[PDB]
Amino acid sequence: PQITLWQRPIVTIKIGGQLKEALLNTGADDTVLEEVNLPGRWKPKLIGGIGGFVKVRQYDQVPIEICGHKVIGTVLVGPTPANVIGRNLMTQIGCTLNF
Amino acid sequence: PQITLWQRPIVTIKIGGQLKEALLNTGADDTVLEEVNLPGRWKPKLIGGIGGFVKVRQYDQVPIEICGHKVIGTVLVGPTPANVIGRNLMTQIGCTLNF
């Protein structure tokens, strides 16, 4: 699709057998989602860095469908004010900024 | 241009008679820039909201050039970890997400 930016670019995603919504965020390096139960291995990762750090669980090579596009990428799972699709997964779906 | 997202989408901007760099950030509603001296009227605005609020100066209808596109929009001026072009100015330049 071509998504204009008059509203927040929120899309539907399928992850870990659940339907969720997340924000396509070109300002975020990484993808961070809350309340998903993923199978398979993880390691803790420290993110943010303002006021302290936030610890999340890093899952690598996670299958995820983003607005109909089935891809694979790292997903960080933990508390986040908004579910965020970062650049790491936007590259996978072939998402570009155009003007 | 068409900008792929393997790296941070940092572009050159002209504002307040200065050349600066800023991040095209679809996760940000507003544009926030540090160390610019804009002429004309402003009002304080509270932004963020995590850990407290941050107070910035809101300047309306500011002429700004973003990657060669001369537009007009609101610019918040205050210390920010990275200069950010928000959706408010990405709409002005006709920037879309495409995949």
């Binding site: 975020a28 390096d29 965020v84 970062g86 | 950030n25 996760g27 950010v84």
Partner: peptide, 7 residues
């Protein structure tokens, strides 16, 4: 809200 982010 306003949303840049690096670990």
């Amino acid at each position: 809200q306003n949303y840049p982010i690096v670990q």
